[PDB]
Design a protein around this ligand. Sequence first.
Ligand SMILES: O=C(NCCCN1CCCC1)c1ccnc(-c2ccccc2OC2CN(CCc3ccc(Cl)c(Cl)c3)C2)c1
Ligand SMILES: C[S@@+](CC[C@H](N)C(=O)[O-])C[C@H]1O[C@@H](n2cnc3c(N)ncnc32)[C@H](O)[C@@H]1O
Ligand SMILES: [Zn+2]
Ligand SMILES: [Zn+2]
Ligand SMILES: [Zn+2]
Length: 429
Amino acid sequence: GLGGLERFCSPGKGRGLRALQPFQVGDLLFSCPAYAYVLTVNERGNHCEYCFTRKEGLSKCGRCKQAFYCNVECQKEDWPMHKLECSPMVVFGENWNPSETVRLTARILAKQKIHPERTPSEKLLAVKEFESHLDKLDNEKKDLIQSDIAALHHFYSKHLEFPDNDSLVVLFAQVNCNGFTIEDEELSHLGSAIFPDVALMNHSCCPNVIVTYKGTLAEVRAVQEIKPGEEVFTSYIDLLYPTEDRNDRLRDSYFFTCECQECTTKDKDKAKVEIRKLSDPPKAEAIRDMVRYARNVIEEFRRAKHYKSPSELLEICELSQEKMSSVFEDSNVYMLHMMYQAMGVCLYMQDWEGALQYGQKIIKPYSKHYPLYSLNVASMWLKLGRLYMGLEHKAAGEKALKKAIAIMEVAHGKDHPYISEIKQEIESH
Ligand SMILES: O=C(NCCCN1CCCC1)c1ccnc(-c2ccccc2OC2CN(CCc3ccc(Cl)c(Cl)c3)C2)c1
Ligand SMILES: C[S@@+](CC[C@H](N)C(=O)[O-])C[C@H]1O[C@@H](n2cnc3c(N)ncnc32)[C@H](O)[C@@H]1O
Ligand SMILES: [Zn+2]
Ligand SMILES: [Zn+2]
Ligand SMILES: [Zn+2]
């Protein structure tokens, strides 16, 4: 197993992870090497395929020209996984489009053939033991899994010996239930991976640990003091949202309803859905209509970023914030959601002033809605610091970069390469 920890039966939460020793804020509970992992398509050329090192001058695979490495060692070490895609990418050309889940699942199947025995990533929970929720699958989820199985056969039949369709539906369901996205220091999507021992941890909206990544290595650090006998919880979702939203997401993606202290008390729900203090106060039904409108625009924007222009996208943000502002306060999470989306459009357009304009409005409400140590808060401080630095506002930039560092020292560890990069940014300017 893992020193100072153990697997146990968590009542009403299946299997979980329990502490056998005290952990202080910032302590590393454990590390977990990726069992299987894939660099996202949009990050190719920026990060090494094998170790995820972000570097300039990465060497391109000569055959597919769509894999980049630190050197010939990273190239060679990645080949058992890269061969599943190398020749297929040049053969299918523009037609090569498997989903990231399919790309990851192909790598799980390849690893199972090469290394059927328990790996150092499975000291407490094995990939074969993963919870699937197969019995809970509705028509929509079975249809998505069936599309994934067809893409798996379509693009990965060369080296894989597939089990029957029944074993593949269990696998794809296990992957959705236990798979991790890997994000960078700005919470930008890097790729997807399997970390079996990390997937043993259950969810809480007031977690006592945070998961971070050091290349393809997952690290688990305390964000609250943990005592012997206490269960170790991480957050599976974005904690900005009120209780109903959080549980709608946990039910849809993980088939359960959270009963943590935040979900039971609903303490932060009032401030999260803050209403304007108007002379004629807004009616209960008028609030409910705006909450419904707010969730609908969130979904509308999500679809729109796939085909609308940057000005159309910014229009959706501006117009929806205008309609919402008649009922909702600026610190309200639905207002904040649109501002964050608008900041993201600005960043893409390289409209640094516009991105800064939004980030400045988001940061104080983020600090009040998110937990004490939050990757979402650290990432916003970091973006703000980098925008201020880029726009020659070096004192404001240094202050924001040091706010990011203070959180990241707890979550990522004092010695994290991301913190060395931020300190170099402070010292170079
Ligand atoms: O890292 C993530 N969040 C932080 C906590 C992670 N923790 C790991 C262990 C527990 C929680 C995360 C977020 C989103 N996506 C994934 C992800 C990564 C890999 C493969 C599928 C992935 O999930 C995608 C998104 N999604 C939800 C819809 C869904 C749910 C069930 C089924 Cl059976 C089907 Cl068909 C479809 C499919 C991971
Ligand atoms: C990644 S697994 C975590 C380990 C899992 N408990 C097991 O036995 O394999 C995620 C699943 O654990 C369960 N789970 C996690 N957190 C929970 C919670 N707070 N309450 C209830 N069930 C929870 C759900 O069934 C969820 O889909
Ligand atoms: Zn490398
Ligand atoms: Zn190649
Ligand atoms: Zn909760």
